[PDB]
């Protein structure tokens, strides 16, 4: 049997899946995850897949740093994963502009506050619920020159020219971050 390798974290809005290699040949896998001072908890028992969903485990405390390891079966052979801190590393999903109503010389662009995998009291918390002040949305607009706006909420109140039409696009952003600070651009919407 060979030890897993290239263990990688695939996380978006906290949906966290651990992937690895190689495509199992006469060997199955068992994953274990934990916090630095916590006990080891096993997942994806004797799976033949080369992936393991660890979402329900990490959303228990997104600000904890987790370590995982993939055991190989024909102490067993294993390989550790890179440390993973959800809050600081989960990718921000592509946003969606929920709407925009013009009012004379100004337009209100509303960003739909998408849901995450973080459960709480039998519900899914929004990206805003989780990051609060750490999250901002930036607007990239123009008259259908480049323009931009930023909000600490999920809405943009900008100036425009009636008679003239504008197109919009938004991005989720966590300023404090270093990597994965921005999400992909939202689809384009025009007045």
């Amino acid at each position: 049997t060979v030890a897993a390798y290239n263990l990688t974290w695939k996380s978006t809005n906290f949906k966290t899946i651990l992937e690895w290699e190689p495509k199992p040949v006469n060997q199955v896998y068992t994953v274990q995850i934990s916090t630095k001072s916590g006990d080891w908890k096993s997942k994806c028992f004797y799976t033949t897949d080369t992936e393991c969903d660890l979402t329900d485990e990490i959303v228990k405390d997104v600000k904890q740093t987790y370590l995982a390891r993939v055991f190989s079966y024909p102490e067993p052979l294993y390989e550790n994963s890179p440390e993973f801190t959800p809050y600081l590393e989960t990718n921000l999903g592509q946003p969606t502009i929920q709407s925009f109503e013009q009012v004379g010389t100004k337009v209100n662009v509303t960003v739909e506050d998408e849901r995450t995998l973080v459960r709480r009291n039998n519900t899914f918390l929004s990206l805003r619920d989780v990051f609060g002040k750490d999250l901002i949305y930036t607007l990239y607009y123009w008259k259908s020159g480049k323009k931009t706006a930023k909000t600490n909420t999920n809405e943009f109140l900008i100036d425009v020219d009636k008679g003239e039409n504008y197109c919009f696009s938004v991005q989720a952003v966590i300023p404090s971050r270093t990597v994965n600070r921005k999400s992909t651009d939202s689809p384009v919407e025009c007045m």
């Binding site: 899946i17 068992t30 096993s42 028992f45 259908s144 651009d185 689809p187």
Partner: protein, 142 residues
């Protein structure tokens, strides 16, 4: 889409890309600018990956660029919510929920056991002392 002579009319995002499927060229004729066209085209032409209905067991799919995300029901997990949290009552999974000893059983369910000096309670998972001073317990704290 293009029909006879419609191209004589000026570009329109609504009539061409919303009320119809528009090609890149048609999109480029409405946005003009290269960047604006591409920023619009990445999403417009990405295609909803939630079409296959990948999320199993009553889960909800959320579309993303060339991918999706499944939101599962409490009793489920997995990339596609294919994992039954109720089909994992094996010993390697948190000691099968047994307080002390766990014994797997092919087909049927696992059975719990206890160390000498203890007995298995009716819940089939807990153990209680059968002697005054069972091993592993600290008297002045009990």
């Amino acid at each position: 889409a293009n029909a006879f002579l419609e191209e004589l009319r000026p570009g329109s995002l609504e009539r061409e890309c919303k009320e119809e499927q528009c090609s890149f060229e048609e999109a480029r004729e409405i946005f003009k600018d290269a960047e604006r066209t591409k920023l619009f085209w990445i999403s417009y032409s990405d295609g909803d990956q939630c079409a296959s209905s990948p999320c199993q067991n009553g889960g909800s799919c959320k579309d993303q660029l060339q991918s999706y995300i499944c939101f599962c029901l409490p009793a489920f997990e997995g990339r596609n919510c294919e994992t039954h949290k109720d089909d994992q009552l094996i010993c390697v999974n948190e000691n099968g929920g047994c307080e002390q000893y766990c014994s797997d059983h092919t087909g049927t369910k696992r059975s719990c056991r206890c160390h000498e000096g203890y007995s298995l309670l009716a819940d089939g998972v807990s153990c209680t002392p059968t002697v005054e001073y069972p091993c592993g317990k600290i008297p002045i704290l009990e």
